[PDB]
């Protein structure tokens, strides 16, 4: 009687574990290479469907990561290799020993001074400490002039250059150099070789989105208490592309996200402790980044004929720095009370017992605050705007870091170990002029570690990749497979 | 804990109106849902509303989608029902219940499907019967 | 919805044997299934929730387990204070109850 026929046409699907098309509106460089153009259609369909949705666990976001990552590789891979530049270079000996780079002992420094001396100075736009870049407590920005002989395309011929390196990506032999000239090589350099970061990386925006190929579609999850993993969405909205996507890299905040909405999110991981705490745009949260100076830069060919930047700079500039705006205070008592209400939190619902905090380790990977503006990264030491936005009781840090204040100093350094695991140092050309650059501030990425119900530890993170799964995260790729089977009695003849 | 409250009759095509008091305890507390079932005499437990939900959002049993409606009050840590189109069938044991959450590293979302929810806490019950 | 039905409907045993009851599900329930016991004139309580905790303050004597389709609450030793209708809540998706069993005393 029944019969099993064929029902083509069917509105069903599976999982799909297939490579995406990206399409972008940058086409200068990456984009026409590689990527379709943004056709601009943004609209979505809502479907009557339950379905489970995991942020860590995708292929729409360990695309994301790993497309980022390889657009990185091949941007890079024909660009000069310094190897050539592993020589010794004549470095002042005077900067050497100021930074600490070189030891020395006829210093024998002393000094008085009061020990109750915490300040608290706040910034903002209408202040011409900002515009002269002297906020109280800022140093300089730690450089050693070095000297050096290389040899262009002519080889019989060679000449000799000025190189300000800064302190952060020297090494220098150390021990009875009773006069001037130590001798320093390149920080990463002997262990591997570093190449140039020649075409414009990290100068402009990345921006670019994720569409499923023919017969493939991409389910979104479309709640207010979607929490990264959840097993039953029972709002699922149908579309052929993700979302526009920023892929910025940074450690501890994430800047300039699309997910930026007037709420707080926070995904955690399924099977862990790790969150990315989303920020409420309400507060309009903000990072201005200053590089005082003006930097000259001059080309150097190198054997090969491929070009090298120097920074002869010859002058001695203040410090990086950066000016946090927005309500930060309150911004953050947020975050606080959005973690005690949380389904996955059971600790304190004291929110004086939650307390943001720095990674521990004497590891400036996860200790400094890392930051691209426009090509160069910058690392920078947030005591002051820690102890500052929790109105933290300092007292007991150190005289220097018992300040409360709405900005950091930070420091340059050129020579990067990237962001994906593998170890890669690359050398990140220096910006002629000088640089500022105005972020938002659009998310937290730290983990939740407490062990009773005082005392709950937000630990700022390092971990950029999960960046992208605030990005994306809520999508699923799914394979439309329109044949259905059925009994019905409706045989042929 | 929980104390029920309301007319002990109501007639056909009337609106019955019943309101659960909440002693040591507020109706703002954060994760709770303050819910309500019925026992009609000699029948099992019927699920048929709630709402502090931190929120404004209630789910309802589908069949009383146009008959239920659930609110809370802040001021009185009380929480009540409304029930239109009074019938027969509607004599029951109202019912009050918290559907407490178990947080923790099982509990994604307080939605059902994604959250063990339970009915720790009772209330006593009213008998309400519908009749002429 | 979710078709939650119970057996036996009616069962007894005596003061100190093993008695269970059988919850059964018409679609999966992937662990969200409670259990309640309810004495005559008196609300219900929870005894045993997500299918394997047992709830604070009900005695060591009950215990259970589940997933899918199938769950079973056990009580290892029935006491002369457990007659009750026992009742099963799926949550996977707004709340139905089984019907209930009845287990008596002997």
């Known amino acids: 009687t029944l019969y099993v026929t064929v029902f083509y046409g069917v509105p069903a699907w599976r999982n799909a574990t297939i490579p995406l098309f990206c399409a972008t509106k940058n086409r200068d460089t990456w984009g026409t290479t590689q990527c379709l153009p943004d056709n601009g259609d943004y609209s979505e369909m809502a479907l009557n469907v339950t379905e489970s949705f995991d942020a860590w666990n995708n292929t729409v976001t360990e695309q994301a990561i790993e497309d980022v990552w390889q657009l990185f590789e091949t941007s890079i891979k024909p660009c000069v290799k310094l190897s050539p530049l592993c020589i010794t270079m004549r470095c002042n000996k005077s900067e050497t020993d100021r930074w600490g780079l070189t030891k020395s002992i006829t210093t024998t420094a002393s000094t008085t001074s009061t020990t109750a001396s915490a300040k608290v100075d706040m910034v903002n736009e209408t202040s011409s400490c900002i515009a002269q870049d002297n906020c109280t407590g800022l140093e300089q920005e730690q450089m050693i002039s070095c000297k050096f002989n290389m040899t262009g395309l002519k080889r019989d011929k060679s000449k000799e250059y000025n190189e300000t390196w800064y302190s952060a990506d020297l090494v220098c032999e150390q021990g009875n150099n009773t006069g001037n000239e130590s001798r320093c090589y390149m920080n990463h350099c002997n262990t591997s070789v570093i190449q140039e970061s020649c075409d414009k990386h990290y100068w402009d925006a990345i921006r670019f989105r994720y569409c499923a190929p023919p017969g493939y579609a991409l389910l979104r999850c479309n709640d207010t208490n979607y929490s990264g993993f959840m097993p039953k969405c029972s709002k699922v909205v149908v579309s052929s592309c993700t979302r526009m996507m920023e892929t910025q890299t940074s450690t501890w905040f994430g800047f300039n996200g699309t997910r930026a909405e007037n709420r707080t999110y926070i995904y955690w991981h399924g099977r862990d402790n790790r969150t990315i705490i989303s920020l409420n745009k309400y507060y309009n949260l903000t990072m201005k980044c200053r590089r005082p100076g003006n930097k000259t830069v001059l080309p150097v060919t190198i054997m090969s004929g491929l070009v090298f930047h120097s920074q002869p700079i010859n002058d001695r500039p203040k410090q990086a720095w950066c000016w946090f705006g927005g309500k930060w205070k309150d911004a953050i008592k947020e975050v606080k009370q959005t973690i005690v209400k949380h389904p996955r939190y059971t600790g304190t619902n004291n929110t004086d017992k939650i307390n943001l905090t720095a990674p521990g380790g004497g590891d400036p990977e996860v200790t400094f605050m890392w930051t691209n503006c426009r090509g160069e990264f910058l690392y920078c030491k947030m005591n002051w705007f820690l102890n500052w936005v929790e109105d933290r009781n300092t007292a007991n840090q150190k005289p220097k870091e018992q300040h409360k204040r709405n900005y950091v100093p930070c420091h340059i350094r050129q020579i990067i170990n990237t962001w994906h695991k593998v170890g890669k140092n690359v050398y990140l050309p220096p910006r002629e002029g000088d640089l500022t650059c105005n972020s938002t501030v659009t998310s937290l990425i730290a983990n939740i570690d407490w062990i009773d119900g005082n005392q709950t530890n937000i630990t700022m993170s390092a971990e950029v990749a999960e960046l992208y799964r605030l990005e994306l995260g809520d999508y699923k790729l799914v394979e439309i497979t329109p044949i259905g089977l059925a009994p019905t009695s409706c045989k042929r003849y | 804990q929980l104390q029920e409250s309301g007319p002990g009759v109501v007639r056909p095509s009337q609106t019955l109106s019943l309101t659960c008091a909440v002693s040591?305890?507020?109706?703002?507390?954060?994760?709770?849902?303050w819910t309500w079932i019925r026992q009609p005499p000699g029948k099992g437990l019927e699920w048929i509303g709630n709402?502090?939900?931190?929120?404004?959002?209630?789910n309802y049993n589908p069949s009383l989608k146009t008959r239920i409606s659930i609110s809370k009050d802040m001021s009185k840590n009380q929480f009540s029902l409304k029930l239109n189109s009074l019938t027969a069938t509607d004599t029951a044991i109202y019912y009050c219940?918290?559907?407490?959450?178990?947080?923790?590293?099982?509990?994604?979302?307080?939605?059902?499907?994604?959250?063990?929810?339970?009915?720790?806490?009772w209330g006593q019950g009213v008998l309400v019967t519908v009749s002429s | 919805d979710i078709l939650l039905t119970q057996s036996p409907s009616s069962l007894s045993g005596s003061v100190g044997d093993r008695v269970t009851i059988t919850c059964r599900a018409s679609?999966?329930?992937?662990?969200?299934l409670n259990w309640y016991q309810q004495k005559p004139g008196k609300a219900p309580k929870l005894l045993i929730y997500?299918?394997?905790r047992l709830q604070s303050g009900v005695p060591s004597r009950f215990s259970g387990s589940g997933s899918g389709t199938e769950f079973t609450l056990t009580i290892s030793s029935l006491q002369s204070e457990d007659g009750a209708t026992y009742y099963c809540?799926?949550?996977?998706?707004?709340?139905?109850f089984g019907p209930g069993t009845k287990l008596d005393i002997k």
């Open positions: 219940a918290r559907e407490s959450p178990s947080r923790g590293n099982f509990c994604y979302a307080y939605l059902y499907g994604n959250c063990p929810l339970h009915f720790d806490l």
């Open positions: 040591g305890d507020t109706v703002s507390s954060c994760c709770f849902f």
């Open positions: 709402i502090s939900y931190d929120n404004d959002n209630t």
């Open positions: 679609q999966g329930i992937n662990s969200y």
């Open positions: 997500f299918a394997n």
């Open positions: 809540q799926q949550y996977d998706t707004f709340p139905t």
